[PDB]
């Protein structure tokens, strides 16, 4: 017999002691090696309730990524309130590695294997595992990158869709590549992101169709963010240690859903910023100018964060804007199928 419980997890990874890359360095002293022979036991005739929105595994992962970033990033200036810290800011090696989350003795992780499980409610295909799959701690906004895919249909996740303050996570079932480049090609901060418009617009139309099912067949319209810091109004992510800000207006083009020119490549204008707002909470940091040469990163778009416009208007349509409420929601997007229980 078991019951829902929280406990201190530990992490496992394939980090290497010879690697200078900062995730590897953190995971070398903060995690144990990955289980060579992972065991998963499918529990016959067991129904179990999950709640991805109230899952302490998420909070624990959050604290790890905060500690990782705190020990790794080296901005020229750290700013907090009135406190200013100038320090050396050498260019670092930055590339997230998969981190596994594991239970200690007396506990186990239950895992929902229902293919269209939305994150809350009963799960009828439950297995037990010692460790999660490897999750890359990718810090990004608007788009979820390099994550896992929904196995069957596109899944809409929300604690409550009627509640406009609750984050919506759209889980894709097919990846769309996003190809970002700061060319060696003169504005050194000017960059761009290329997306296959045919692939993307097909997926985005699929997303709108799934949103329709959850919102009483109302018309689904996208709009750009109404306000916020640049990390919010733009697709924000890091590539090779550099902080990228990409304009996603073209990525949510209502004309290309439901006619001429939407098949070509979508090019998003981007900027690399030296001065950023810290996602850990309150704080500003300034980094050195971008590294020389071509800066390039290809990522998989595997999810979208959305916010729905609140308030009451005679509604033919619901309006959604890219961006979610919280960095922890990124961890939720991967941890949704897991729950810790205590063995009795």
């Amino acid at each position, epitope marked *: 017999v078991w019951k829902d419980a929280d406990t201190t997890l530990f992490c496992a990874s394939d980090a290497k002691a010879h690697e200078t890359e900062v995730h590897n360095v953190w995971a070398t002293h903060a995690c144990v090696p990955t289980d060579p022979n992972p065991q998963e036991i499918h529990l016959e005739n067991v129904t179990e309730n999950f709640n991805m929105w109230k899952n302490n595994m998420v909070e624990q992962m959050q604290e790890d990524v905060i500690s990782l970033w705190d020990q790794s990033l080296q901005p020229c200036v750290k700013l907090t309130g009135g406190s200013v810290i100038k320090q050396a800011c050498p260019k670092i090696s930055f590339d997230p590695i998969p981190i596994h989350y594991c239970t200690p003795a007396g506990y186990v992780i239950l895992k929902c294997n229902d293919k269209n499980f939305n994150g809350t409610g009963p799960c009828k295909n439950v297995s037990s595992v010692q460790c999660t799959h490897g999750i890359k701690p990718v810090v990004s906004t608007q788009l979820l990158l390099n994550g896992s895919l929904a196995e069957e249909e596109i899944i809409i996740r929300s604690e409550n869709l009627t509640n406009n*303050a609750k984050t919506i996570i759209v889980h894709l079932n097919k990846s769309v590549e996003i190809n970002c480049t700061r060319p060696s090609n003169g504005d050194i901060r000017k960059a761009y992101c290329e997306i296959n418009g045919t692939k993307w617009n097909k997926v985005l139309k699929q997303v709108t169709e799934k949103l329709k099912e959850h919102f009483n067949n109302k018309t689904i319209i996208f709009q750009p963010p*109404s306000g916020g*810091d640049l990390e919010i109004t733009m697709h924000h992510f890091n590539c090779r240690g550099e902080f990228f800000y990409c304009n996603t207006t073209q990525l949510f083009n209502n004309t290309c859903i439901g006619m001429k020119g939407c098949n070509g490549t979508i090019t998003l204008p981007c900027k690399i910023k030296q001065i950023i707002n810290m996602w850990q909470g309150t704080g500003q940091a300034m980094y050195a100018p971008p590294i020389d040469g071509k800066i390039n990163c290809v990522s998989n778009i595997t999810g979208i964060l959305l916010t729905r416009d*609140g308030g*009451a*208007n005679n509604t033919s349509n619901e309006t959604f804007r890219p961006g979610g409420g919280n960095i922890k929601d990124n961890w939720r997007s991967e941890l949704y199928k897991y729950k810790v229980v205590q063995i009795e």
Partner: antibody
Amino acid sequence: QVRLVQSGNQVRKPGASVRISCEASGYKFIDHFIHWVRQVPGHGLEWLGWINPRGGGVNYSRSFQGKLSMTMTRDNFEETAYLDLSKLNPGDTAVYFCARGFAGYEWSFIWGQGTLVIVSS
Amino acid sequence: EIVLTQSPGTLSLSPGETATLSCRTSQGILSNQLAWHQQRRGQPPRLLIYGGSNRAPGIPERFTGSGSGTDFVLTIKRLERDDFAVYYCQILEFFGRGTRVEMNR
């Protein structure tokens, strides 16, 4: 105790702007949305929108789109939220409240004391 | 939109009596999604009940929130002078039009 203290009553001509502040205290500012609500004298409460201090993201009520030009901002260091109303019309004469949900209940509003804005020629 | 209907619009009761205020919703809601507020004239609103049935700190025990599904109730026992006020229910971003509790004599 959670407390929201707003700036003082204002008088504006049509076409002008007003910026209302909402100073929070008694809690960790960045962990709670700030909402704004208006109440025309003699009428009921109408939600305007919220701001998320973590990033400054906002949600503006569809009911006021095209009818009220508003901008919500915040200063996390000063733990203050701001409501900026531009291009005011006489119909914008109202009391404006900021609010914060009770802990664990984002829509169970705890209220600021309100700011009266008069718009008149 | 969740349509909230408060009833009655006005109550006239003697001090000492019990006020029963209703908030009815067009669709079933969750209890946590509802709040009651009190507003005395010329004053800001004050949170009374959060999450449908939880009395806010400092709120007197004579104020009690109950209800479920589509019908929520605020009951005020032993009405005192300061209780004669307007009461609003809130569900998510939506507010009822209010019930005014007035003093009978």
